[PDB]
Design an enzyme around this catalytic site. Structure first.
Site, short mmCIF file in Angstrom:
data_model
loop_
_atom_site.label_atom_id
_atom_site.label_comp_id
_atom_site.label_asym_id
_atom_site.label_seq_id
_atom_site.Cartn_x
_atom_site.Cartn_y
_atom_site.Cartn_z
N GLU B 357 0.82 -1.20 0.00
CA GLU B 357 0.00 0.00 0.00
C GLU B 357 0.86 1.26 0.00
OE1 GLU B 357 -3.22 -0.27 -0.57
OE2 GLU B 357 -3.04 -2.42 -0.47
N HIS B 487 -15.63 -9.77 -9.30
CA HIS B 487 -15.34 -8.86 -10.40
C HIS B 487 -16.38 -8.92 -11.49
CE1 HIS B 487 -11.84 -9.47 -8.08
NE2 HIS B 487 -11.18 -8.52 -8.72
ZN LIG Z 1 -2.84 -2.66 -3.96
#
Ligand SMILES: [Zn+2]
Lengths: 188, 597
Positions: B357, B487
């Site tokens: 992240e 998805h």
């Molecule tokens: Zn990511």
């Protein structure tokens, strides 16, 4: 004989928007030029033509002082010879400046949670600003080849835009108060 | 007074009025995601209602500056992203269906539960429950049940919507002058008007296909190995030459074979690397983890996290009272507010997914000085791939001894490395056939090469041919298995995962060649290597301001997706697998199945 009221210019609670930057004329008096160094708050404090110590031992014919609020990415344009919305369309300093630009971060005061929009700047103009020029015309910018009739529309924008100052910006986009000291009766 | 000049001024008013409306939306979309309260649910939607509407206002405006008269390509690029009038091109009556479908599908997927026959007293969401079965259970029938009851009890409900979904989405895609909706998604990679760097949408289907063919030898040998290992855990259910039963693959779909590691560890005698325990003892907090992650990026030259990042980010979890979404997320909120929101436990796998992240944040912060519209990674795949190479470099045993979480008394023999490579293969290599299929099935559906009366026929044919995977129960056209994956029924492209995989090893080979690393790529660690940082940053700071083929070439020296680094990373495993298979069968028959029928 008389003391120069620089404090009421630095200590003032409310500041002008940069497009209508304030100017106070300090003359026939004498004040301290080192009470502006060991303040240790000023993130920026760069004289671009003079020297703090010498100022005390020199008398001046005219000491002007300007005060305003700009964003952090823009205090760099309050320097001699730079280009940017603020220096072209809001406050321009000359290339033969003898003076001092003093600044500091004012999130404590000028940033409010969820919005502080009192401070303005001039986004568009028909030309650049002569040094120390002040333009306060709220007149519509004709970007196009189509006249605007004092009406906003296609390629016709209102020239002032609003600073959004939030207390969770980067130093990047946070408010900042600037003072620009300009320069045989004002001694030290 | 030319249209290019006029376009610059319009973009220059759009850049200043969006930086704040987009900040009002991010700023309010953080409160719903940290204080979850019905009040904050409403402050969010209004902020996004303002933002969403502002864009289409500007959208219709931008169209009076036609690209046909624009030469400055950054100017052309911004006007393009803005001129795309998007889903509003429908009649207002159809846009209500389309969005209610998308929302109906989403609310089925999140709220679907199944209840068990031998205990209707207990009912299971996928969210925490079925996924726990599909990850840990070794009972064939229980796995069979959670697999099949999901795709029937919840997958069938999506079948009608999915039809209407495709019908409407196609109308929008054609109106915008894309031939089908899959073609519309391929436009993300599309580059024009730059010599030697152009890239057409139809050039992606070839490159994804030409590159998959060089994966097959590796996968086939991974397939065969895992099959032989599965054929112990399920003695009377698996054929040594047949496809793998879809419900035995380690999770609900088989997207990643990660959970099959214990049933397929190469040298299971060797003690595995898990530093979860060394942290607790030296006293580590989410503050330390993210302070450590910050250090790694400063050893390569990159800037450290902003003062407001430490003050406004949510790194831990108050819990009880406040109710955040604990999905690790990275946030570019606007105006310098960069934040990472992760409910971080003191695990290692949460320490490596924090380097991921912060890679995002590091990347978001590099191209922060670009214009507003050009603030995003070079293509859909760029942005997750920058994060994975950070986990690759920090997971390495070489790195864990620097930071002091691995014992210097750890022996790095060959066996621990084949064990490390295989756990990587189950995830990274596993999902490549799975991902390439799922799009190619959609690409075809949207192209119409697969009729409604052959939807689930041709799905599982492709599972058999391309993926070596078979259904445990025959499925008719009443099922809709594709949309049983998150998805699929949420309207997100999925080839992004295929191209991100390939990119990350291209990136990792380069950054580890400039760090003068000698050894197998898998042991690399770009730490302390500011020559590495500088080559990365040069691409990071571009943003989508340049054609993605040029950004990639700023790092790796090639204009395209390249498998040769992927195979290279896993070749010490590949060669071991080959020997391991000399008496196994490698491949699969397309017409075996675990059922009478
Ligand atoms: Zn990511």
């Amino acid at each position: 004989t008389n003391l120069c009221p620089f404090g009421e210019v630095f200590n003032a609670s409310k500041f002008a928007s940069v497009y209508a930057w304030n100017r106070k004329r300090i003359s026939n008096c004498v004040a301290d030029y080192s009470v502006l160094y060991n303040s240790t708050s000023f993130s920026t404090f760069k004289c671009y033509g003079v020297s703090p110590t010498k100022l005390n031992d020199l008398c001046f014919t005219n000491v002007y002082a300007d005060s305003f609020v700009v964003k952090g990415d823009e205090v760099r344009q309050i320097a001699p010879g730079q280009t940017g919305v603020i220096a072209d369309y809001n406050y321009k300093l000359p290339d033969d400046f003898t003076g001092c630009v003093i600044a500091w971060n004012s999130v404590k005061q000028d940033a409010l949670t969820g919005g502080n929009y009192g401070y303005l700047y001039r986004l568009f103009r028909k030309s650049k600003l002569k040094p120390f020029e002040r333009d306060i015309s709220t007149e519509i910018y004709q970007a196009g080849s189509t006249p605007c009739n004092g009406q906003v529309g296609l390629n016709c924008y209102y020239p002032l835009e609003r600073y959004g100052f939030h207390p969770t910006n980067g130093v990047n986009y946070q408010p900042f108060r600037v003072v620009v000291l300009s320069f045989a009766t004002v001694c030290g | 007074s030319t249209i290019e000049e006029q376009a610059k001024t319009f973009l220059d008013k759009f850049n200043h009025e969006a930086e704040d409306l987009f900040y009002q939306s991010s700023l309010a979309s953080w409160n719903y995601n940290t204080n979850i309260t019905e009040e904050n649910v409403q402050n969010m939607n209004n902020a996004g209602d303002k933002w969403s509407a502002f864009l289409k206002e500007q959208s219709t405006l931008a169209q009076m500056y036609p690209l046909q008269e624009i030469q400055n390509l950054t100017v052309k690029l911004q006007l393009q992203a803005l001129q795309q009038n998007g889903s509003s091109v429908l009649s207002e009556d159809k846009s209500k269906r389309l969005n209610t479908i998308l929302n109906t599908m989403s609310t089925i997927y999140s709220t679907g539960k199944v209840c068990n026959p031998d205990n209707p007293q207990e009912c299971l969401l996928l969210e925490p429950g079925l996924n726990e079965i599909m990850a840990n259970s070794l009972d064939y029938n229980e796995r069979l049940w959670a697999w099949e009851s999901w795709r029937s009890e919840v997958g069938k409900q999506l079948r009608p919507l999915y039809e209407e979904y495709v019908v409407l989405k196609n109308e929008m895609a054609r109106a915008n002058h894309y031939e089908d909706y899959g073609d519309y998604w391929r436009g993300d990679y599309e580059v024009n008007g730059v010599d030697g760097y152009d890239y057409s949408r139809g050039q992606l289907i070839e490159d994804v296909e030409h590159t998959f063919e060089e994966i097959k030898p590796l996968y086939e040998h991974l397939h065969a190995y895992v099959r032989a290992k599965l054929m112990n855990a399920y003695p009377s259910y698996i054929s040594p030459i047949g496809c793998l039963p879809a419900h035995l693959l380690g999770d609900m779909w088989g997207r990643f074979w990660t959970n099959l590691y214990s049933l397929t560890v190469p040298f299971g005698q060797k003690p595995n690397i898990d530093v979860t325990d060394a942290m607790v003892d030296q006293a580590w907090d989410a503050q330390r983890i993210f302070k450590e992650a910050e250090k790694f990026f400063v050893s390569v030259g990159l800037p450290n996290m902003t003062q407001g990042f430490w003050e406004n980010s949510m790194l831990t979890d108050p819990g009880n009272v406040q109710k955040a979404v604990c999905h690790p997320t990275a946030w570019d909120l606007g105006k310098g507010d960069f934040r990472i929101l992760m409910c971080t436990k003191v695990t290692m796998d949460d320490f490596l997914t924090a380097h991921h992240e912060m890679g995002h944040i590091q990347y978001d912060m590099a191209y922060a000085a670009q214009p507003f519209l050009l603030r995003n990674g070079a293509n859909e795949g760029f942005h997750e791939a920058v994060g994975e190479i950070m986990s690759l470099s920090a997971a390495t045993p070489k790195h864990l001894k620097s930071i002091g979480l691995l014992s210097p008394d750890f022996q790095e023999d060959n066996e621990t490395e084949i064990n490390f490579l295989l756990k990587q293969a189950l995830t990274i290599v596993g999902t490549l056939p799975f991902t390439y299929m799922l799009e190619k099935w959609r690409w075809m559906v949207f192209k119409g090469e697969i009729p409604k009366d052959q939807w689930m026929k041709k799905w599982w044919e492709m599972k058999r041919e391309i993926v070596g995977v078979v259904e445990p129960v025959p499925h008719d056209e009443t099922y809709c298995d594709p949309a049983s994956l998150f998805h699929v029924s949420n309207d997100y492209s999925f080839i992004r995962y295929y191209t991100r995989t390939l990119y990350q090893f291209q990136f990792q080979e380069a950054l580890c060649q400039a760090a003068k690393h000698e050894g197998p790529l898998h042991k690399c660690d770009i730490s302390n290597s500011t020559e590495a940082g500088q080559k990365l940053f040069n691409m990071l700071r571009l943003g989508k301001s340049e054609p993605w083929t040029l950004a990639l070439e700023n790092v790796v020296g090639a204009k395209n997706m390249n498998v040769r680094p992927l195979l290279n990373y896993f070749e010490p495993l590949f060669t071991w697998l080959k020997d391991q298979n000399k008496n196994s069968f490698v491949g699969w028959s397309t017409d075996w199945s675990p059922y009478a029928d």
